[PDB]
Each structure stands twice: as structure tokens, then as C-alpha cells.
Nanobody, 127 residues
Framework: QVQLVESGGGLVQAGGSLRLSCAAS????????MGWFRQAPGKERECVAA????????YYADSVKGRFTISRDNAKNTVYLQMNSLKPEDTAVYYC??????????????????WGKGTQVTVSSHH
């Protein structure tokens, strides 16, 4: 069975970093575009980042440009999201997703071929 499993999330202080990891298993993924979505309760799910397979094109939501970096490792069947300078507005469930069609990311996404179950990221501040 095909699975995308996110890890590396959880709690982090504002200004901190996390590196999400998506372990993709059960089929060949090197010809899939991979991406990250996020959704906070009461808000729509949005595409945060994506990367093509057939070219090195990447997409980032405006709110994360310069802060988040998507990359992948085909040998490890993993996709990463380096998330820096985190703010409370980054708090959400982050989902890994795979799609044959890179044009299905980003600001008006299509449906993905596979979805991870998601992992919680919580960015808190303290004053």
C-alpha cells in the first residue's frame, strides 16, 4: 500500500526552525511532483510548497517565501520541508502530498494523487 508519512513537526518557539520529513513508500515516486500543504482549524488548506519531478521548478506560497525550502531525496524516498523563522501563523497540520502533475500545485491546487495523514506543527510565542 502507498503511504506518505510526515514527521519532524511538533512544538517550536517562534523564530525557531523545524525540518519536516515525508517518508513515501510502496511505489516509485521519482516521476511524482511532491509538495506540502497545511491547514489550521477554521481555515482552508493551502499549498505551502511543491517541486516538479521533470524539471527543478519549485513553488512556495507567498507567506513562506524566503523561510521554507522544499527538497527531496529519491534514494531515500523522502521529501523535506525546511521551515525557518517560524511564526504563530505557521501553526497547522502539515500534509505531504504527491501528484503526477506539478501544475496541480499551488494557489488553486488540483487534487493530489496521494495525501499523507498530516502532522501537527505548533509555533508558540512567549512574552
Amino acid at each position: 500500500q502507498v503511504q506518505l508519512v510526515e514527521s519532524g513537526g511538533g512544538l517550536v518557539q517562534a523564530g525557531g526552525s523545524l525540518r519536516l520529513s515525508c517518508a513515501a513508500s510502496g511505489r516509485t515516486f521519482s516521476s511524482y511532483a511532491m509538495g506540502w500543504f497545511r491547514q489550521a482549524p477554521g481555515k482552508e488548506r493551502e499549498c505551502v510548497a511543491a517541486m516538479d519531478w521533470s524539471t527543478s521548478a519549485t513553488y512556495y506560497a507567498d507567506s513562506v517565501k524566503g523561510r521554507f525550502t522544499i527538497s527531496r531525496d529519491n534514494a531515500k524516498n523522502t521529501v523535506y520541508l525546511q521551515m525557518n523563522s517560524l511564526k504563530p501563523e505557521d501553526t497547522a497540520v502539515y500534509y505531504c502530498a504527491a501528484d503526477l502533475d506539478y501544475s496541480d500545485y499551488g494557489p488553486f491546487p488540483g487534487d493530489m494523487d496521494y495525501w499523507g495523514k498530516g502532522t501537527q506543527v505548533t509555533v508558540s510565542s512567549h512574552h
